[PDB]
Amino acid sequence: EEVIDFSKPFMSLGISIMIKKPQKSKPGVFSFLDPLAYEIWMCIVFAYIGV
């Protein structure tokens, strides 16, 4: 701008983050526990013990 003259921006932008699209993750061993949180499983174990 010190040596030329600009116009008002015709397109405003900024820095941003590019990532690879999340894919269907390869199922993990012990993915059969995913429907319930770990805390539920531990409470189940200790309720079994207590009962």
């Binding site: 894919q23 269907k24 390869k26 993990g28 061993v29």
Partner: protein, 185 residues
Amino acid sequence: EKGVQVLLTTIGAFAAFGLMTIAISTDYWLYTRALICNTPGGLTHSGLWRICCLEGLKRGVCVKINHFDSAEYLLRVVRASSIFPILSAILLLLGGVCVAASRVYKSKRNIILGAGILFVAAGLSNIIGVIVYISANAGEKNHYSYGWSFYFGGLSFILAEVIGVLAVNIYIERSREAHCQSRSD
């Protein structure tokens, strides 16, 4: 009788060992389509170690399989080593040897027991190897199929379990005979 049961046990041990060695050495486990076939890809028949192209310009050439996330790494290692089918074959061999010894040291009754334990453990190891193989093949190129080597492994598993059952029955009969003879004496 006892003799025929022992004969069946030894025959089954030999047959299962042979089938499993054949399946391991053989390279006809999986029929699929692969990118590295010189033209989604070309037909291939694979195994545990090497893969061979069929119906292609590079027909008949067989090349070592290029394997390669901690769990994925461990699975790849176990699949590459194929330690579980090999262990199954080794345990079958040792069980057959123990049976042959039982054909000599007729007094020691805790031998035809080790044979049965080894046969059952071999069946379990074969199950594990099959699971590992199937799991590792999958990734994330269709209409794939399994060959006669895979079913040789399955037959080996079935035979091993059967002969383990027979060996345990033999141990039962022998221990019962000895115990009844002793108590009545």
